[PDB]
From Swiss-Prot, chains A, C, E, F, I, K:
Top-rank taxon: Eukaryota
Effect after changing F24S: In HPRI; Los-Angeles
Residues of the full protein shown: 25 to 54 of 110
Species annotation: Homo sapiens (Human)
Effect seen on changing R22Q: In MODY10; reduces binding affinity to INSR; reduces biological activity; reduces folding properties
Effect of H10D: In HPRI; Providence
Protein name, entry field: Insulin B chain
Length: 30, 21, 30, 21, 30, 30, 21, 21, 30, 21, 30, 21
């Protein structure tokens, strides 16, 4: 695949895509 | 974290899987 | 604020907006 | 849960706020 | 909730979310 | 341009694109 | 209206343009 | 306006309600 | 990665993400 | 095709990758 | 209509909108 | 190309049609 910058709501769109049913955590404080 | 790995820097879809449950 | 009908990626969108820098966990059923 | 609830019927921003870290 | 930067189509997504059925105006000329 | 089937936030998206800097009003029925 | 029309059947960009300020 | 309040500067969801009809 | 149910603009989103800088072609049936 | 397949049933990222240039 | 900056996934959203059924190509290497 | 015409520079919806099939 590829490597790009993924920021903000675009980051969480991508996580939704990749994780889907597995679910995910978005934790910007790290 | 994810913001540094993926937004500030550059990341792959495989890396993004690091943050699935 | 008003009630929401949110499905697929649109939920993850709303969660991003609502939580901001605290981030969130997206956990669907099976 | 919230995922299914927001999709199948309705959902509020306040209920969504329960899912922030 | 939180305070973030909301620009462009992300601004109008947020307005849709908050206003919903009430409807809204997006007027960048102010 | 082609005809559009637009629902929920996707309408507000299209309106953003079409109107640009003039902005727009989003006014749903009840 | 336009909101319901674009969703229920179809809609054109030209009709949408009527909603700009 | 909204762009200055919300994009250039920072705004809350309650502020965004200022622009509902 | 998980299986995807993608419709309308959400497909074009996924394609953008998957292809990145190589880009892609979006070709629906009739 | 892929457009209809991803919408009507399901689709994989690997199948989507066939559509990159 | 209008003229704005269209970048990344926002570019391909716009192409989807304009082209629709015709389909399109997104080729950032040009 | 499209990125230069539309992202780096500025483009219209009519220009965007240049890239339809
Ligand atoms: Cl949908
Ligand atoms: Cl952006
Ligand atoms: Zn964006
Ligand atoms: Zn959608």
């Amino acid at each position: 695949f590829v490597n790009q910058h993924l920021c903000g709501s675009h980051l969480v769109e991508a996580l939704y895509l990749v994780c889907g049913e597995r679910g995910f955590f978005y934790t910007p404080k790290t | 974290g994810i913001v540094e790995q993926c937004c500030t820097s550059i990341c792959s879809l495989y890396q993004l899987e690091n943050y699935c449950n």
